Amino acid sequence: TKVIENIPETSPDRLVHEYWDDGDCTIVMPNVKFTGFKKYASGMLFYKASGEIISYYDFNYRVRDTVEIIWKPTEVFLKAFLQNQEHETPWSPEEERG
Amino acid sequence: MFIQEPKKLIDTGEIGNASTGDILFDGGNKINSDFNAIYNAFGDQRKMAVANGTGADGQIIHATGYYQKHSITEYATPVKVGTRHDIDTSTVGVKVIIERGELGDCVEFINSNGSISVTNPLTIQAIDSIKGVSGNLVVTSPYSKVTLRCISSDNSTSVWNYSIESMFGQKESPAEGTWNISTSGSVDIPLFHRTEYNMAKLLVTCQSVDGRKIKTAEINILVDTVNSEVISSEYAVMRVGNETEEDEIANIAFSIKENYVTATISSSTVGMRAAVKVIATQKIGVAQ
Amino acid sequence: MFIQEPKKLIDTGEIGNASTGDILFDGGNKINSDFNAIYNAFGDQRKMAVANGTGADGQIIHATGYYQKHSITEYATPVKVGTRHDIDTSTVGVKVIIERGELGDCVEFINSNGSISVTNPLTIQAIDSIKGVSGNLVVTSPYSKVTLRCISSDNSTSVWNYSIESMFGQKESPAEGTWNISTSGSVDIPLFHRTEYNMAKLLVTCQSVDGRKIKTAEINILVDTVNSEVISSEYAVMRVGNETEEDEIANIAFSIKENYVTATISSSTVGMRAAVKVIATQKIGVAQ
């Protein structure tokens, strides 16, 4: 149970960032290092320290004793997208007037 | 004028369970600024141009507080309430413009050297009003004390009644009190140590237990130094329960007893409440 | 007297990039000492002999501030300006020797129990001078307030003018103000709630709009309790724009209206500025 954590109140060291932006949300992480498990592991969990969980790294297979992971989307795993949708639009009959 | 922030407080939910340095790195910023207001209040804010109130030269707290001295350029901006200022208008007459205040908001100011004159007046704008003052009050008084208090804030209306006082002088009354004229019908009251005043003026009111007979006179006294006497002038006599146009409801006699100017107030009427109050005095010091 | 350092401020360039404990180990030394002055100012410095101002018994801040009580041994050293002291000379007359001050430097002192007498005088040395005081000022006044203010510092010359005030008493004026005598030529002014004073003394000045006719009289009043009246004595009459040796430029009448002593100031002349100012009052309380 390594942690990715602290440097709170957005202090410069952390480099851990949520970025709201550009109609969107950008959430960056540094690559994760793991070693000395001595044991057979599968998956990886990012466990919100306060509790619950943010997401799950399935790890695709099963390893032992060490893990190294980068986010191929350049260390930022998440870019969240709201783009372009409107819900409301229905279709109805109408009188053409004229 | 060094600007102060309000109180700014630290999170203890931080620290031992969180990143130590960071949460502290923040806390100092508070603490440093936090004491700044404190010392800037009770010490010269021009000590910030110094080591920033640090070092032995740094801002110190005055149990009396400090009246902040500055340029006019700073008072050229509405100056916040709650502040003690000392400015000397010898250079020029100034306006001290004050923010719109709140009910209870105070503004304390002085000219210590008393350079204030008509040649060195002092103008003040406390926003939207100052009670009794149409527009901006001007102050020509040397050794005055500018104290504003906002007696109404309401919505837009900052109403400042105004007090001002000579920063110095002898403001005390040597003798003020009240007693009841004895079954003996008189007493002797030490007024002040016989040396304290060359002149005094007092007001005695001798009133019956039932209040119907109340005696009043206008007491002007000349302390006689060499003879150890006190010379009186009584006039403007007024009465209520007076049964005789002669001395009535009581009598007023004087003396110096036990190195005290001692008034002897004798009433033929028993149960007479006499309040002895010395309203004004005078003594001679050195020339100049 | 617990000694205070000036403000002493923390380095934030320290901490998260440097050794945490050390830079903090230093900072506490500041902070601790830093609040000390604060609480020592507004609380008893004899609370340092206690838990050092800590605990519930520790020094507390007084919005009024605290007048620091001590031995004479401590005042046997020049005592710094800015300090509030309370010492009672019942034990003996003392000298309070004060450092050479700066323009604006204050020294506040009191005897709360008023033990100060001639038997319990109070001597003061503020270095190099005290304005109006040759050598060291002595204070025999009970319930006095010692306030020094250094009105010149310059190079060597610490000039202290001096204010002193009775720590107590009734210092208020019930009625002071100014108005213009109405087109009706008079008005009624509530002076004080009819019960507030057995005696009052006021000064009214009735001056024409153009200031040429200005009326002045010496107003001495006896409030009549049982009859709900006020008895006046007028004398020492003075005028400028008086056209007649009779009542002129205005008239002064009295009454008690709406549980107020109410003066009725009537001027045959329109546009007369009358400033009503009650200079001195008296009321009777309990015996002793």
Side-chain angles (χ1 to χ4, degrees):
Chain A
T1 65
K2 185 184 288 179
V3 193
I4 291 174
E5 79 291 9
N6 277 338
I7 307 98
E9 67 263 6
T10 64
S11 297
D13 293 344
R14 72 162 80 212
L15 71 81
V16 170
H17 305 299
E18 186 281 334
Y19 296 136
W20 294 100
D21 188 4
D22 61 19
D24 283 341
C25 174
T26 299
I27 298 172
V28 64
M29 294 178 70
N31 61 340
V32 297
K33 296 179 179 179
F34 292 105
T35 188
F37 303 155
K38 295 181 64 63
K39 190 175 295 296
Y40 181 81
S42 180
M44 172 180 66
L45 181 69
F46 294 154
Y47 167 85
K48 171 57 170 66
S50 63
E52 295 87 2
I53 285 159
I54 68 105
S55 172
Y56 178 68
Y57 178 87
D58 187 14
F59 185 72
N60 190 343
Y61 65 101
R62 294 173 180 77
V63 75
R64 299 183 64 257
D65 313 356
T66 188
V67 162
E68 297 305 322
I69 297 161
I70 63 101
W71 290 271
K72 56 180 298 177
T74 307
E75 292 92 9
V76 47
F77 61 102
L78 187 145
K79 192 165 68 75
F81 298 159
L82 293 170
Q83 64 290 3
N84 191 32
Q85 68 280 356
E86 73 288 2
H87 185 282
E88 184 282 336
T89 60
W91 175 254
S92 64
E94 68 181 343
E95 296 301 321
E96 185 64 15
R97 188 180 58 81
Chain B
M1 296 188 287
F2 172 80
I3 181 63
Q4 74 179 26
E5 69 177 344
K7 178 170 69 184
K8 190 172 182 289
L9 294 175
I10 302 168
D11 179 7
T12 60
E14 293 172 347
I15 318 168
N17 63 344
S19 295
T20 301
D22 299 344
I23 64 93
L24 297 174
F25 179 86
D26 310 343
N29 309 135
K30 301 175 179 175
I31 294 169
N32 295 289
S33 174
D34 292 344
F35 289 104
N36 295 344
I38 304 170
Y39 292 84
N40 286 278
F42 300 90
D44 186 5
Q45 290 179 330
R46 301 166 300 181
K47 299 174 180 177
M48 298 305 295
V50 187
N52 298 337
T54 55
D57 53 353
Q59 292 180 335
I60 65 169
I61 298 302
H62 306 162
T64 67
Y66 175 72
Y67 295 82
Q68 293 300 327
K69 301 181 174 73
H70 306 292
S71 66
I72 306 162
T73 61
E74 311 180 4
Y75 301 91
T77 304
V79 179
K80 70 186 188 70
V81 304
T83 58
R84 295 188 183 179
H85 297 289
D86 187 6
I87 302 298
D88 300 348
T89 55
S90 61
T91 62
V92 65
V94 304
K95 69 180 180 65
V96 176
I97 54 174
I98 297 172
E99 65 188 349
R100 177 177 294 172
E102 293 178 351
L103 173 60
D105 287 352
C106 184
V107 175
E108 289 173 353
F109 170 83
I110 55 169
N111 175 327
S112 296
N113 64 32
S115 67
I116 293 176
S117 63
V118 296
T119 64
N120 301 132
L122 193 141
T123 300
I124 290 170
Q125 183 173 355
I127 299 303
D128 193 12
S129 62
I130 293 169
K131 178 186 173 62
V133 174
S134 64
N136 285 346
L137 176 60
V138 63
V139 176
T140 61
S141 176
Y143 298 89
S144 63
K145 180 177 179 181
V146 168
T147 302
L148 271 75
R149 185 60 52 87
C150 183
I151 63 172
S152 176
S153 61
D154 301 345
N155 187 339
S156 64
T157 306
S158 177
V159 180
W160 292 85
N161 190 340
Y162 179 70
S163 60
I164 186 170
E165 59 185 340
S166 296
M167 292 173 68
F168 305 101
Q170 182 62 61
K171 295 175 179 177
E172 299 192 349
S173 176
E176 182 179 2
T178 302
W179 53 281
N180 300 349
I181 287 171
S182 61
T183 61
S184 65
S186 181
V187 79
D188 287 344
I189 295 170
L191 301 178
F192 58 85
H193 293 284
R194 67 172 64 196
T195 60
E196 297 185 358
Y197 292 122
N198 303 131
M199 176 181 283
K201 180 177 175 60
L202 61 83
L203 296 173
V204 171
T205 302
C206 297
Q207 188 173 0
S208 65
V209 282
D210 56 354
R212 63 178 181 88
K213 291 184 67 64
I214 181 170
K215 178 170 178 287
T216 55
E218 286 72 353
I219 298 97
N220 294 342
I221 67 169
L222 168 52
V223 180
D224 183 354
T225 61
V226 177
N227 298 337
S228 297
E229 298 172 352
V230 58
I231 284 92
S232 64
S233 179
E234 302 302 320
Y235 60 96
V237 173
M238 294 182 288
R239 303 289 177 271
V240 170
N242 54 343
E243 298 177 352
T244 302
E245 294 81 358
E246 302 304 320
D247 178 69
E248 186 66 17
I249 302 173
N251 185 29
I252 293 172
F254 292 154
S255 61
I256 294 176
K257 295 170 178 171
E258 297 175 350
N259 291 282
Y260 300 127
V261 179
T262 299
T264 299
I265 305 304
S266 62
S267 177
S268 297
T269 303
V270 297
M272 293 300 303
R273 299 194 173 86
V276 173
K277 181 178 180 180
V278 175
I279 53 173
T281 57
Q282 190 176 358
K283 184 183 179 179
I284 287 173
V286 182
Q288 296 174 335
Chain C
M1 296 188 287
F2 172 80
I3 181 63
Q4 74 179 26
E5 69 177 344
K7 178 170 69 184
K8 190 172 182 289
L9 294 175
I10 302 168
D11 179 7
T12 60
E14 293 172 347
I15 318 168
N17 63 344
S19 295
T20 301
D22 299 344
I23 64 93
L24 297 174
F25 179 86
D26 310 343
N29 309 135
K30 301 175 179 175
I31 294 169
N32 295 289
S33 174
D34 292 344
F35 289 104
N36 295 344
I38 304 170
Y39 292 84
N40 286 278
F42 300 90
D44 187 5
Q45 290 179 330
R46 301 166 300 181
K47 299 174 180 177
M48 298 305 295
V50 187
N52 298 337
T54 55
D57 53 353
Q59 292 181 335
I60 65 169
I61 298 302
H62 306 162
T64 67
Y66 175 72
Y67 295 82
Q68 293 300 327
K69 301 181 174 73
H70 306 292
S71 66
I72 306 162
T73 61
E74 311 180 3
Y75 301 91
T77 304
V79 179
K80 70 186 188 70
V81 304
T83 58
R84 295 188 183 179
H85 297 289
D86 187 6
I87 302 298
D88 300 348
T89 55
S90 61
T91 62
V92 65
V94 304
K95 69 179 180 65
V96 176
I97 53 174
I98 297 172
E99 65 188 349
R100 177 177 294 172
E102 293 178 351
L103 174 60
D105 287 352
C106 184
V107 175
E108 290 173 353
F109 170 83
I110 55 169
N111 175 327
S112 296
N113 64 32
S115 66
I116 293 176
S117 63
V118 296
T119 64
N120 301 132
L122 193 141
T123 300
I124 290 170
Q125 183 173 355
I127 299 303
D128 193 12
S129 62
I130 293 169
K131 178 186 173 62
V133 174
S134 64
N136 285 346
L137 176 60
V138 63
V139 176
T140 61
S141 176
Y143 298 89
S144 63
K145 180 178 179 181
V146 168
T147 302
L148 271 75
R149 185 60 52 87
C150 183
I151 63 172
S152 176
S153 61
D154 301 345
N155 187 339
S156 64
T157 306
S158 177
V159 180
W160 292 85
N161 190 340
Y162 179 70
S163 60
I164 186 170
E165 59 185 340
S166 296
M167 292 173 68
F168 305 101
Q170 182 62 61
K171 295 175 179 177
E172 299 192 349
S173 176
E176 182 179 2
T178 302
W179 53 281
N180 300 349
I181 287 171
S182 61
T183 61
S184 65
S186 181
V187 79
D188 287 344
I189 295 170
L191 301 178
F192 58 85
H193 293 284
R194 67 172 64 196
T195 60
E196 297 185 358
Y197 292 122
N198 303 131
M199 176 181 283
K201 181 177 175 60
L202 61 83
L203 296 173
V204 171
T205 302
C206 297
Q207 188 173 0
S208 65
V209 282
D210 56 354
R212 63 178 181 88
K213 291 184 67 64
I214 181 170
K215 178 170 177 288
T216 55
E218 286 72 353
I219 298 97
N220 294 342
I221 67 169
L222 168 52
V223 180
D224 183 354
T225 61
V226 177
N227 298 337
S228 297
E229 298 172 352
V230 58
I231 284 92
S232 64
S233 179
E234 303 302 320
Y235 60 96
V237 173
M238 294 182 288
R239 303 289 177 271
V240 170
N242 53 343
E243 298 177 352
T244 302
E245 294 81 358
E246 302 304 320
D247 178 69
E248 186 66 17
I249 302 173
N251 185 29
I252 293 172
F254 292 154
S255 61
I256 294 176
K257 295 170 178 171
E258 297 174 350
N259 291 282
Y260 300 127
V261 179
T262 299
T264 299
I265 305 304
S266 62
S267 177
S268 297
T269 303
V270 297
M272 293 300 303
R273 299 194 173 86
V276 173
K277 181 178 180 180
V278 175
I279 53 173
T281 57
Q282 190 176 358
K283 184 183 179 179
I284 287 173
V286 182
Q288 296 174 335

